[PDB]
């Protein structure tokens, strides 16, 4: 039997202000949304695993897209609070390399950073990628498609929102099956109702959602969305875990 993840921690990593048309492509632009930024910490048998690394420190007190980030929201300060130094981490998982998911990746210079090849290669070329998110000499562990990280921790390839976006399917000891969509769906309605949202390839984003729905049919997991203001406040967050 595969081990489950001992603890899954949801960690607030600051916020990001966007036009409301980013959670619903049909909306008349002109209203602001203040979205939560997340990272996740997985305690496993072989060691702690961090999923995403917050915003780049150039966003600290430095707000189309307006980062709302304090010093406390820097990944190493998050790491201090959880009780680890970067080198304690078994793996870093980058769901993708957008600035609000990979901006702290430079803090981890020894830990393998799991990233999809299509994401990594896009970040080497596409304009939307900040250098903080694609530093050249980190220990990248480049994968393609679905991948088991450690027993209990699986990566589901869900491109569309970005060229190589990936989501997480986790089994925890306390909660059983958990799906973290990350940016494969910002909100429940992006997923449930297939309300269109911001992305590199919306058509591919839809098929990724359709694939996740096949997984949900079979596994019936609890699902946590990437930037969901409605779901946010009833999540148990660090120091609590699920």
Question: DSSP of 109-159, one letter per residue?
Answer: SSS-EEEEHHHHHHHTT-TT--GGGS-TTS-EEEE-S-EEEETTEEEEE--
Show binding-site residues: 96, 98, 100-101, 161, 183, 227
**Rule CB under 5 A: is residue 7 a binding residue for Zn ion?**
no
Residue 3 is classified by DSSP as P
Other CB atoms within 10 A of residue 188 CB: 16
Rounded least distance, CB 165 to Zn ion, Å: 7
Rounded least distance, CB 88 to Zn ion, Å: 25
Q: Which residues inside 167-186 make contact with Zn ion, applying CB under 5 A?
A: 183
Rounded least distance, CB 47 to Zn ion, Å: 26
As separate numbers, helices (DSSP H) first and strands (DSSP E) second, the chain gives 6, 12
Q: Going by DSSP bridges, is the β-strand pair 47-51/32-44 parallel, antiparallel, or unpaired? A: antiparallel
Q: Closer CB to Zn ion, residue 173 or residue 189?
A: 189
Rounded least distance, CB 217 to Zn ion, Å: 25
Rounded least distance, CB 13 to Zn ion, Å: 10
- 181 contacts 224 by C-beta, under 8 angstroms: yes
Letters for 41-80 (x = contact with Zn ion by CB under 5 A, - = none) are ----------------------------------------
Residue nearest to Zn ion (CB): 98
Show binding-site residues for Zn(2+): 96, 98, 100-101, 161, 183, 227
One residue of 7, 15, 74, 98 binding Zn ion per CB under 5 A:
98
Question: How many chain residues are in contact with Zn ion, going by CB under 5 A?
Answer: 3
Cα–Cα distance measured from residue 109 to residue 139, given in angstroms and rounded to the nearest whole number: 6
End-to-end CA distance of the chain: 20
Which residues make up the interface to Zn ion (CB under 5 A)?
A: 98, 100, 183
């Amino acid at each position: 039997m595969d081990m489950t993840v001992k603890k899954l921690y949801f960690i607030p990593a600051g916020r990001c202000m966007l036009d409301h048309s980013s959670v619903n492509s049909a909306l008349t632009p002109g209203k602001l949304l203040n979205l939560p930024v997340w990272c996740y910490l997985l305690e496993t048998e072989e060691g702690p695993i961090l999923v995403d690394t917050g915003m780049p420190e150039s966003a600290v007190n430095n707000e189309q897209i307006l980062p709302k980030m304090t010093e406390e929201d820097r990944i190493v300060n998050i790491l201090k609070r959880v009780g680890y130094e970067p080198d304690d981490l078994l793996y870093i998982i980058s769901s993708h390399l957008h600035f609000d998911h990979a901006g702290g990746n430079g803090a981890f210079t020894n830990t393998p950073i799991i990233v999809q090849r299509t994401e990594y290669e896009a970040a080497l070329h596409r304009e939307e990628y900040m250098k903080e998110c694609i530093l050249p000499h980190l220990n990248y562990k480049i994968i393609e498609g679905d991948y088991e990280v450690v027993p209990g921790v699986q990566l589901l390839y869900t491109p569309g929102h970005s060229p190589g976006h990936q989501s997480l399917f986790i089994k925890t000891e306390q909660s059983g099956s958990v799906l973290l969509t990350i940016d494969a769906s910002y909100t429940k309605e992006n997923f449930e109702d297939e309300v269109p949202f911001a992305g590199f390839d919306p058509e591919l984003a839809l098929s990724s959602i359709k694939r996740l729905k096949e997984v949900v049919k079979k596994e019936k997991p609890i699902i946590f969305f990437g930037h969901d203001i409605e779901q946010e406040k009833s999540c148990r967050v660090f120091p609590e875990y699920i």
